Amino acid sequence: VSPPPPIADEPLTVNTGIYLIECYSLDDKAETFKVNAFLSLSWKDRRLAFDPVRSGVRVKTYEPEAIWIPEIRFVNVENARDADVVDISVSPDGTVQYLERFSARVLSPLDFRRYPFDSQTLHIYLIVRSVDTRNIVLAVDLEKVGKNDDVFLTGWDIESFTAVVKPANFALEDRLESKLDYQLRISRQYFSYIPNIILPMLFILFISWTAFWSTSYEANVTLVVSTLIAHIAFNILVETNLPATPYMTYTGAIIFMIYLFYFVAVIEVTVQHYLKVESQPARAASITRASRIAFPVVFLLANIILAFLFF
Amino acid sequence: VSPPPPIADEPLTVNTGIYLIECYSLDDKAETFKVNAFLSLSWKDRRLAFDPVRSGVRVKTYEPEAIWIPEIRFVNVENARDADVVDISVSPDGTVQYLERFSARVLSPLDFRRYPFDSQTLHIYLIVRSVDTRNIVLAVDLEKVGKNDDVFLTGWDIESFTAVVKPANFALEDRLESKLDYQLRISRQYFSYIPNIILPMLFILFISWTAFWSTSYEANVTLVVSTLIAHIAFNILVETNLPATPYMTYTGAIIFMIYLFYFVAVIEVTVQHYLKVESQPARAASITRASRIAFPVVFLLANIILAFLFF
Amino acid sequence: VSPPPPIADEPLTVNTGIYLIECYSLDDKAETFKVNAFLSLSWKDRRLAFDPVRSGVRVKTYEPEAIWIPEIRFVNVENARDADVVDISVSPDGTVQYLERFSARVLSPLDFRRYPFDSQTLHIYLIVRSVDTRNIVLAVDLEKVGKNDDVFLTGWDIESFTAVVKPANFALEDRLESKLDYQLRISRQYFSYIPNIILPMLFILFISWTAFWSTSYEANVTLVVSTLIAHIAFNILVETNLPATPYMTYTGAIIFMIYLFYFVAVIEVTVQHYLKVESQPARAASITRASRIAFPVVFLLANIILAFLFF
Amino acid sequence: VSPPPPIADEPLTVNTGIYLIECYSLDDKAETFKVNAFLSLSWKDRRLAFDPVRSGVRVKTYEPEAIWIPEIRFVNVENARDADVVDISVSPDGTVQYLERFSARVLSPLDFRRYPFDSQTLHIYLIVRSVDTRNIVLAVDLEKVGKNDDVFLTGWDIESFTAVVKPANFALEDRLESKLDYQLRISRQYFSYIPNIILPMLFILFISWTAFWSTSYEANVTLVVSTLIAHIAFNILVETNLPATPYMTYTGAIIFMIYLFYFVAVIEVTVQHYLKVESQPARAASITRASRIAFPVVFLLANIILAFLFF
Amino acid sequence: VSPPPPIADEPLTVNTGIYLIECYSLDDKAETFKVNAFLSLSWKDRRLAFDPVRSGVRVKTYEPEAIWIPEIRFVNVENARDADVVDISVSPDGTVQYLERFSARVLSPLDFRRYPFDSQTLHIYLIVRSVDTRNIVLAVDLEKVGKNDDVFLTGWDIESFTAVVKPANFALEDRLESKLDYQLRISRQYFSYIPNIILPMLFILFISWTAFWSTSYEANVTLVVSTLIAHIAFNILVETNLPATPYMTYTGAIIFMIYLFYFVAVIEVTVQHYLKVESQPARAASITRASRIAFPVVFLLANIILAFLFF
Ligand SMILES: [Cl-]
Ligand SMILES: [Cl-]
Ligand SMILES: [Cl-]
Ligand SMILES: [Cl-]
Ligand SMILES: [Cl-]
Ligand SMILES: [Cl-]
Ligand SMILES: [Cl-]
Ligand code: NA
Ligand code: NA
Ligand code: NA
Ligand code: NA
Ligand code: NA
Ligand code: NA
């Protein structure tokens, strides 16, 4: 067929709704997630109108090839959604109600600055291109926007799913394009990061500081170098569950900062020993005693500064 | 076509059955599993009735496009199942018997609290949306629910596969939706975790405690720090075969707890040495002797407490 | 169409054959393998019979939608095979000869008890469901069962591919089902496991035993703990190329057993040192001398016992 | 149908445009990236011309099977693009305007010489094969070449997307082929490599040099060998995020160079000790003092030389 | 339709050609590679002949469903190729020229004996099954065999792509099958293996030998055991980029051999110490001095022997 023609000179309003059935596979590195959802569309096609009293039925079904249907697409998807059309109902006045269930893999960038205490706003951008015959524009039927109460996005809490109601209308390749921004707001379940990464990483650091209550260089080197190695493991573990950002992450900072602490601890340990060998154990012992306070205090100050800067 | 019309204002009952042919790929991290199964549907379409004596045959075949078939979907799947229709039989009174074989990848959340001694209840949710003309409702033909005796779910024992017989009927976007809960109950084969992870992890810990029968700081540091490193490896190995939970897992607890034991062992070892150097080997030696009992005893108490809390 | 009706009261025999063109991707963890093969089917459809003199050709081609073809399926596949039909020939008497080339990923469980000296029997189960009108039964044309001379399963030797000729006929959901068992018998190329895993693992163990010719506790601890760590690496490497079994594997046993040897070596080393410090180097030295023989002898006995128990 | 015939004897010009909607998945190892884009085509088909005054409309839609459309393909793709046709408009003079949205995975080699400070030029090669009846040739409508302002290629900055306007026309299998080069110019966000890899790698190296202020062989060996091990980890980490090049990468050089520094540090440490044992601590001490300056100075010179050679 | 019938009693010659557009993804472990290529076919169908002077055109196009086309298949592919048909031209005498572009994933075994200095011969086997009506045979049009000059197979140099011109004709399931062997000859770019694996592995080994200029058992144990651990890492790294072969690889040998050197170095170090403790430092010192020459000399001899045996 081809598009409904205008009563006057008005653009065709296509009403939209997304209802999320499943969110899954939030891939931090790819910056993607998968969705399974109802997509609902509604518009006026005069051509399809009818009399309820004459026709005997108050609604009419159609198969999708029978009528004109707007080419709605997702902007930020990897490949075109799989969609199974569920239902098409036309009411007497020629109002069409379309309903598909779809699944798609969606590109949407993530801000890792506060990882792993971060929150994100995922987007699904619906779009339509205007044809020559007629301009098409999108709108949001809020009654058809939602998510079910089970949706679980393993590793994240889901706050809200709402749509920015006013589309962005713009020219692309000499046609009008109308674009809606659906927004899925989430925040990361940070709990497990504490016992699995953060505390272990501290424990190894604090073990490194036992060298400040020790006069054995051979022990000290072993303490500080072994723990430094373990820290690297955690650095590596962490930098692998995350992509290459052009900014420091919060955890990144702490991790990096900690290298400085290991480095300086090695210097102290080196200096202590060097002085003992020159028979200045008195001076050595002042530095060691200072280190016992300076290290943990500066560590604490530094973290407060960092948390201040990142939150 | 379109749905069979009601004698009077009664909903259409669609009878369901799932018969599992294969379960496989229980992915702990994605919280998914794959299934290969018969799906059976049955319903009354009066329009399709016939006389056996007149028509000459007592059952009639059809191809799926020929008749009306309800749009049954799975709720908790990644993408719509692949289904090949096997057989459609209509009996004289217009009773339709549908049978497909399908495969699907199913989202179903797992409770890791008692891992790896955990059991799970997987769900497959069948659903149908009511049309305008007619309300549809699902029911369970218990004679068509089962699994074959071979279904092996590598890494798990299968207890039962049963369906909750009373559907959950609810409004979604101003239509009735009817949802059945099929339940596959499993429990994890925990055996291999003992030799591969648990005992090794203990053995390294117990080796760390040999420092309590030693006066060599250089040895002790090496004992405790090396074993601590090995423990980290196991922590890492374990946290990678599992997803990020917002709750402690049982194994998680033990693993985390064990870091405290390493930490305190380092303190003891540090203290012992420090006293020897101040010529108080007598006090050192009391602490070392106490540690020999305190460590294993507190370890045992702590584990009893944990197992109590988790089981 | 629908199935050929019987001359008398006999079930329809569908003759089968599988000819393997490629085996590949034996995935130990998933317990799957991939196959690329001819599937050959043959049956009598009288309805399709014809005169060579009238029709002008001596055999007739068809496209699969044109005629009735039995719904033959694989039982133990992940998803339905990709099949490209190669040829359908119907001979004058209505004898159909079907030939597809297919590929599928096949579930078939593996017994890891003697890994990596294990052999396996893979299965491909062909099946057909009987319709209402007619009972269908499968049989094996032995002349159409085989494999290519160059079919290779990287990491395995292929012994035989044969079919159990007598189907298993049984009721499922009130219809007859007929099931054939094709069997691919293989055995693992164990060679590479010797230089890459087994010997290294021994070498590190034997290095640990050099502590029996040493009086340096600091050295000994380092010897035994470092090698123990290397052993863990191999344990981890091995447990990752394999799934979680509810039984001990042979290699698993050895690996696990070896932890006990490391543990006891640490005890010996600890004891030796403790006695030296109490000025009983004489007793220490007896234990050390005994250990030099006891360890390797008990190791040998233990392995003989294990190999006996597993083979 | 088949191609438009020429007014005279001129080749058929097909005008092209690519508008990038999404770039993603730049896989360094595979040397690929994924794209989602509009492809626009335009050409003259006289046969389709019409009178605006007679026909009543000034533009005509068609479905793709209705008219002749050139077989445009991508050269450097893994498999043929998924394309959904968006719009086909024909203007009175028989000028066709084609528009598809496509997605494809594109092979395009990367030069790793300056990694991770590298820039790249990705290519998308459009191509068309001439038929017997007519020569077909491609051209670039610059007004239909662009990318939207959001395109984000996680880990990279995007400079430009432009097309080389003059096609390369050449014989392949005795027909003319016409090929356009679209060019996406990018440069790597190198920031994260500094804190995650580069600085750590230096810090461990500088720690190794503390052995130059130490007289303990047992400590020194531990310092230098442990840090060497950590360096290997980083070598391994790095060589895994990259493919096997037949040329040195910049980072590769530094990494490799650093092994020489560890090697020589071990020699120094070995020599120092050997002399102390022969009661020549005076000579030892000159070498150690020299090493304190020589190592960092030569390290600096060497890096300047390398950066000069690579930039 | 069905096949062209013979003028006399001759088999139908189908002329073939493969022109490689892209080679990629040479996966060493799977022993596969991916290809993107033109497949060209040519044969005589008398039925399609025509008069150029009468018909007015010297060539005729067809769509593939219109005419008979031989079922050419690849033998050694995972799944049937994706193919888009490009062009079908028929010349007056009924000579058909077919051209598709395809992509496929190809199984072809690799000989790892000389890795990573190995060369390989990849195969693509084209095949055709004869029908009842007619025998089909394949041949190679050498003018349609080639690859473009860009084909880059990341990690490999490409020597040649040629076809063995004489097919192998043989019986399979009582029909003739005709099989062509296309051969892609490649050799591995070994350069990067030197700096990334081989030299590091030597450097660690040579560091182990510094224990021959040292009298400290505690140092020596640390030197030799730490380096042994690093060697294991490289063994593991290497055995993971490769499959399980039933033969020694060259690199495998060296790696394995090197374990023996570490083992014996531990024995030497153990012996040296044991003698020092029994106050025989004189004998110890002879063995240590011998080791300084024996180790590197035997290492060199052994490698010469191995390279001789493998090349
Ligand atoms: Cl879409
Ligand atoms: Cl579904
Ligand atoms: Cl409700
Ligand atoms: Cl309703
Ligand atoms: Cl199947
Ligand atoms: Cl394409
Ligand atoms: Cl194929
Ligand atoms: Na339509
Ligand atoms: Na239907
Ligand atoms: Na040490
Ligand atoms: Na059929
Ligand atoms: Na067309
Ligand atoms: Na055809």
Residue E291 tokens read as: 């080791």
Among candidates B236, B243, B256 on the partner chain, residue whose Cβ is nearest the Cβ of A237: B236
Task: Supply the Cα-derived Rg of chain D in whole angstroms.
Answer: 31
User: Is the minimum CB–CB distance between C246 and chain B shorter than 8 Å?
Assistant: yes
Q: Are A23 and A2 in contact (CB under 8 A)?
A: no
Q: Report the greatest alpha carbon distance in chain E.
A: 112
Which range marks the domain in which residue A181 is found? 1-192
Q: Is E263 on the interface with C (CB under 8 A)?
A: yes
**Residue keyed to tokens 């298993």:** C168
Question: Of E217, A220, C274, C223, which is closest to residue B210 (Cα–Cα)?
Answer: C274
Q: Which helix (H) or strand (E) element contains residue A181?
A: strand A176-188
Can you tell me the distance from the alpha carbon of A44 to that of A4, in angstroms, rounded to the nearest whole number?
8
D266 vs E contacts (CB less than 8 Å):
207, 210
How many Å lie between the alpha carbon of B69 and the closest alpha carbon of chain C? 20
Output the CA A177–ligand 1 centroid distance in Å: 15
Q: What are phi and psi of E271, to 5 degrees?
A: -65, -50
Pairwise CB contact (< 8 Å): D207 & A252:
no
Residue A276 contacts B where some CB pair is shorter than 8 Å: no
- On whether the CB atoms of residues C219 and E217 are closer than 8 A, the answer is yes
Whether residues E101 and D73 touch (CB distance < 8 A) is answered with yes
Q: Which residues of B touch C247 (CB under 8 A)?
A: 191
Which tokens sit at D294?
A: 């020589």
Q: What is the helix (H) or strand (E) element at residue A305, kind and residue range?
A: helix A281-310
Q: Which ligand is nearest to the CA of A98?
A: 8
In the numeric block, which tokens belong to residue C125? 């189960």
User: Residue B227 in contact with residue B207, Cβ under 8 Å?
Assistant: yes
H-helix or E-strand spanning residue C146: strand C146-147
Kindly state whether residues A17 and A57 are assigned to the same domain.
yes
Q: Which ligand is nearest to the CA of A84?
A: 2
Q: Which residues, numbered 153 to 182 in chain C, qualify as contacts with chain E under a Cβ-Cβ cut-off of 8 Å? A: 154-155
Kindly determine whether residue D203 and residue A246, on different chains, have CB atoms separated by under 8 Å: no
Q: How many CB pairs under 8 A join C and E?
A: 123
D163: closest CA of chain A, how far (Å): 17
∠D10-D15-D20 over CA atoms, to 5°?
Answer: 165
Decide if E77 and C36 are in contact by the 8 Å CB cutoff.
yes
Which experimental approach was used here?
Answer: X-ray
Collapsing DSSP to helix, strand or coil, D311 comes out as: coil
What is the rounded CA–CA span in Å between residue D310 and residue E71?
54
Domain boundary among B157, B192, B227: B192
Q: Do D239 and E196 touch (CB under 8 A)?
A: yes
User: Is A30–D154 a contact, with Cβ atoms under 8 angstroms apart?
Assistant: yes
CA distance to partner chain B, nearest, from residue C90 (Å): 25
Tell me how far apart the terminal alpha carbons of chain E are, to the nearest angstrom. Answer: 56
Does one domain contain both B166 and B249? Answer: no
Closest Cα in chain C, distance from residue B133 (Å):
32
User: Could you identify the residue written with the tokens 């930020």?
Assistant: A76
* Residue to substitute from D26, D153, D190, D204, interface A, most A β-carbons within 10 A: D204
Q: Is E131 in the same domain as E249?
A: no
Type and span of the H or E element at E38: strand E32-44
In this structure, the answer to whether residues E17 and E76 fall within a common structural domain is yes
Q: Of the ligands numbered here, which is closest to the C-alpha atom of E69?
A: 13
Minimal Cβ distance to D225: which of E199, E214, E222: E222
Facing E200 at nearest CB: one of D217, D235, D266: D235
Given C61, C203, C223, which is nearest E2 (Cβ)? Answer: C61
Final residue of a structural domain among C174, C192, C210: C192
B239 touches chain A (CB under 8 A): yes
Shortest CB distance from D218 goes to which of A76, A131, A218?
A: A218
What's B286's domain CATH number? 1.20.58.390
C-alpha closest to that of B126 among B68, B58, B182: B182
Instruction: Say how far apart CA B72 and CA B96 lie, in whole Å.
Output: 15
Collect all residues of chain B within an 8 Å Cβ-Cβ radius of residue C270: 210, 213-214
C2 with B195: Cβ contact below 8 A: no
C259 touches chain E (CB under 8 A): no
Query: Are residues E106 and E177 both part of a single domain?
Result: yes
What is the C-alpha separation between C243 and C245, in angstroms, rounded? 6
What does the block give as tokens for E119?
């060369």
The bound ligand whose nearest atom lies closest to the alpha carbon of A220 is 10
For C45, the 3-state DSSP assignment is: coil
Count contacts between B and C (CB, < 8 Å): 120
Q: Is D223 on the interface with A (CB under 8 A)?
A: yes
If one counts the domains in chain C, the total is 2
Q: To which H or E segment does residue A166 belong?
A: strand A156-171
DSSP assignment of chain B? --PPPPSSSPPEEEEEEEEEEEEEEEETTTTEEEEEEEEEEEEE-GGG---HHHHS-SSEE--TTTS----EEESSBSS--EEEEEEEEEETTTEEEEEEEEEEEEE-----TTTTS-EEEEEEEEEEE--SS--EEEEE-GGG-EE-TT--BTTEEEEEEEEEEEEEEEESSSSEEEEEEEEEEEEE--TTHIIIIIHHHHHHHHHHHGGGG---HHHHHHHHHHHHHHHHHHHHHHHHTS---SS--HHHHHHHHHHHHHHHHHHHHHHHHHHHHTT-HHHHHHHHHHHHHHHHHHHHHHHHHHHHHH-
Same domain, D48 and D185: yes
Q: Which helix (H) or strand (E) holds C170?
A: strand C156-171
**CB pair distance less than 8 Å for D252 and E196:** yes
Residue of D nearest to A131 (CA): D87
For residue D78, give the ligand nearest its CA. 6
CA E70 to ligand 7 centroid distance, Å? 12
CA A86 / ligand 8 centre spacing (Å): 14
Q: Which C residues in the span 122-141 are in contact with E, Cβ-Cβ below 8 Å?
A: none
- Cα–Cα dist B105/A25, whole Å: 13
Mutation test of the interface with chain A: which of B1, B181, B231, B232, choosing the one with the most A Cβ atoms within 10 A?
A: B232
Sequence-ordered list of residues with C-beta below 8 angstroms from that of C144, at least 6 positions apart, any chain: C15, C16, C17, C18, C19, C38, C40, E173
A282 & A251 share domain = yes
Q: How far is B177 from chain C (nearest CA, A)?
A: 28
Q: Are B300 and B103 in contact (CB under 8 A)?
A: no
D237·A236 Cβ contact <8 A: yes
Same-domain status, D16 and D150: yes
Broken C–N links (> 2.5 Å) in chain D, after residues? none
Q: Chain E closest CA to D148's CA: distance in Å?
A: 30
Flag if C233 and E228 touch (Cβ within 8 Å).
Answer: no
> Final residue of a domain: which of E192, E225, E254?
E192
Residue C210 is given by DSSP the state: G
Contact call for E80 and C103, based on CB within 8 A: yes
Calpha distance E306→E299 (Å, rounded): 11
Chain D: residue nearest A273 by CA? D214
Whole-number Å distance, alpha carbon E16 to ligand 7 midpoint, is 14
CATH number at residue C158: 2.70.170.10
* Whether E200 and E300 share a structural domain: yes
* DSSP E strand boundaries for chain D: 12-27, 32-44, 60-61, 72-74, 82-91, 95-107, 119-129, 136-140, 146-147, 156-171, 176-188
Local structure of E300: helix, strand or coil: helix
B79 min Cα distance to partner chain A (Å): 6
Contacts 24+ apart (CB under 8 A), B290-297: B291/B212, B291/B265, B292/B209, B292/B212, B292/B213, B295/B209, B295/B212, B295/B261, B295/B264, B295/B265, B296/B209
Does D218 share its domain with D293?
A: yes
Q: Are A185 and A153 in contact (CB under 8 A)?
A: no
Q: Within an 8 Å CB–CB cutoff, is residue D87 touching chain A? A: yes
Is residue C141 located within the same domain as residue C246?
no
Is the CB of C75 inside 8 Å of chain E's CB atoms? no
- Facing residue for B38 by CB, picked from C79, C173, C248: C173
Give yes or no: residues E302 and E205 share one domain.
Answer: yes
The token duo for B46 is: 């009066």
- In chain C, the residue whose alpha carbon lies closest to the alpha carbon of E268 is C210
Q: Which residues in B lie closer than 8 A to residue A214 (C-beta atoms)? A: 217, 270, 273-274
> Cβ neighbours of residue D22 under 8 Å, at least 6 residues apart?
A76, A78, A107, D34, D35, D36, D37, D151
Q: Is E25 left (phi over 0), alpha (psi -120 to 50) or beta?
A: left
Residues constituting chain D: 311
CA of E30 to the centre of ligand 11 (A): 37
